[PDB]
Amino acid sequence: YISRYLTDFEPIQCLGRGGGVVFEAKNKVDDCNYAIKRIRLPNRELAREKVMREVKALAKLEHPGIVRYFNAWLEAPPEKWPKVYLYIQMQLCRKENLKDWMNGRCTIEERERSVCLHIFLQIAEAVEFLHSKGLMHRNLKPSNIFFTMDDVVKVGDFGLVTTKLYMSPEQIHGNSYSHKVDIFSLGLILFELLYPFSTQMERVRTLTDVRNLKFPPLFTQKYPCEYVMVQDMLSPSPMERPEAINIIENAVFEDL
Numbered sequence: 452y453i454s455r456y457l458t459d460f461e462p463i464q465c466l467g468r469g470g471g472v473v474f475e476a477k478n479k480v481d482d483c484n485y486a487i488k489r490i491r492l493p494n495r496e497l498a499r500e501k502v503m504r505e506v507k508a509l510a511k512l513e514h515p516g517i518v519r520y521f522n523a524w525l526e527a528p529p530e531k532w533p534k535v536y537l538y539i540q541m542q543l544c545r546k547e548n549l550k551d552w553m554n555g556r557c558t559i560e561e562r563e564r565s566v567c568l569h570i571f572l573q574i575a576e577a578v579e580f581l582h583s584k585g586l587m588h589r590n591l592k593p594s595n596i597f598f599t600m601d602d603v604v605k606v607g608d609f610g611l612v613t614t615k616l617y618m619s620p621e622q623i624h625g626n627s628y629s630h631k632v633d634i635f636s637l638g639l640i641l642f643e644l645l646y647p648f649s650t651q652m653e654r655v656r657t658l659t660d661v662r663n664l665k666f667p668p669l670f671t672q673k674y675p676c677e678y679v680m681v682q683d684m685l686s687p688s689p690m691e692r693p694e695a696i697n698i699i700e701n702a703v704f705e706d707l
């Protein structure tokens with residue numbers, strides 16, 4: 452038995468904690484560094500065949516807000532001590548993610564209104580695209596939103612499933628039946644972009660409050676239009692929240 456991953460790539464480090472795993476690996480033939488994700492597949496035939504049906508439909512996706520796909524492949528290695536792993540090879544993004552970007556700019560000066568909305572609009576446009584193809588991200592949060600080396604915003608890892616601060620409440624109690632879950636996540640992200648934080652304590656407290664529609668008074672005054680958008684997006688009743696498309700069309704972006 453030969454391992455495809457081990458022959459063709461020389462591993463660099465880990466990028467993603469798994470509960471699967473995400474490595475940085477140089478491809479030997481093309482000398483480029485990729486984000487490789489090793490999933491352990493289920494034992495069940497009909498669980499596996501549902502994952503595979505997914506990679507099939509995600510492979511087809513092309514959008515500027517979706518990380519660039521390269522390859523997907525299976526390995527069934529011998530028992531170290533019937534396990535089959537799925538590898539996906541993705542464009543390696545900039546190591547500074549949206550959390551890191553935000554953590555480095557803790558003054559309203561550094562959070563240039565126009566830059567923030569631009570960043571957000573990309574995240575929103577990506578989510579529209581996914582929804583238009585009857586797909587939901589279900590994993591939007593600043594730690595899983597990236598920039599390319601070309602400095603383009605990408606919605607991060609999603610799909611292929613076997614911190615809860617950005618999940619909608621219905622996502623946290625029952626299965627996340629609705630695709631509106633993504634609209635909720637967007638609500639928080641838009642706010643957090645426009646309103647920097649000094650401490651971790653302050654951030655947890657303030658977001659936890661905004662979830663319950665208890666907005667800082669300086670925010671409500673400083674950004675009146677955004678405040679109504681973020682109120683809509685955070686509607687406790689999913690059916691009340693706007694569609695992805697409705698947010699893009701909002702006049703706040705019109706001329707930028």
Ligand SMILES: Cc1nc(N)c2c(-c3ccc(NC(=O)[C@H](O)c4cccc(C(F)(F)F)c4)cc3C)cn(C)c2n1
Pocket residue numbers: 466467473486487488505506507509510511512517518520522523539540541542543544545546597606607608609610611
């Ligand atoms: C520096 C860096 N760059 C990355 N791209 C990632 C990623 C990062 C981003 C996106 C994704 N996957 C996807 O977007 C989707 O799963 C997907 C899209 C399109 C096709 C496919 C297909 F392969 F067909 F299944 C999957 C995965 C990782 C592993 C995670 N981390 C921690 C990263 N760090």
